[PDB]
Symmetry: C2
Subunit: 140 residues, 2 copies
């Protein structure tokens, strides 16, 4: 019962170990469903890819069990069912964000040794304020 809620390009600032910053269009796909492998738990799946590099692949899978710790750490006030909607809402801001509009939202992907940390930050006069922080694994 895998349902895709979102599947389109998003401008992301990519940062790697020995590469300068790069702003490029990465394809995000957000799915919600159930894994028969993991006791039929509800799951949120996010995949990051590039239309110009078929090997550039990053994936995240969050179960309802996993979300419990994630909710406490980042003080999330909504439930698991509502979580994907808020992520999409944050991505919409990054899509609509134009250079100069302060505070400006933006998506960031920091690759470290292969594995990566994804963030959507709100940039004000003082700091990059991370609205969400998620760890991705390379591949599908």
């Amino acid at each position: 019962t895998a349902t895709t809620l979102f599947w389109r390009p998003v401008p992301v600032h990519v940062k790697q170990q020995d590469r300068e910053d790069v702003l490029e269009e990465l394809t995000f796909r957000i799915l919600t469903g159930v894994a028969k492998q993991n006791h039929n738990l509800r799951i949120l799946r996010i995949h990051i890819s590039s239309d110009s590099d078929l090997f550039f692949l990053h994936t995240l899978e969050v179960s309802e069990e996993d979300f419990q710790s994630l909710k406490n750490d980042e003080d999330i006030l909504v439930d698991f069912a509502s979580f994907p909607g808020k992520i999409i809402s944050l991505l919409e801001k990054c899509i609509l964000a134009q250079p100069g509009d302060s505070p400006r939202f933006q998506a960031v992907l920091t690759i470290r040794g292969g594995e990566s940390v994804f963030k959507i930050v709100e940039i004000n006069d003082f700091r990059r304020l991370p609205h969400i922080t998620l760890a991705f694994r390379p591949g599908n």
Copy 2:
């Protein structure tokens, strides 16, 4: 030493045993030069309460401590501009109203010895900490 800021601030004081109390705390922010430490610049923040002489919490951020804090929270300003941003955040807490959305509030979580000060933004999604600082008891 030199005081940049010395005002009362509304703070949601949280202790273990969840004694949640919204009381006015006095905040004093000082900037100075450390004689004993080759004139290393220091930012000092003292939290106190007129109601309780034993209610004392202090933070000291040297230039070195700031470089570390700057990295963790992705701060975009230098050490000299940092106090001004804290004041702005504290002001949002002072002027905060019940019906605001998003709403800003200052939170002081006391845990045994150390405590943790935060200025969070409560929106439709989460509690978003704009700044987080570790305080220690005393002066």
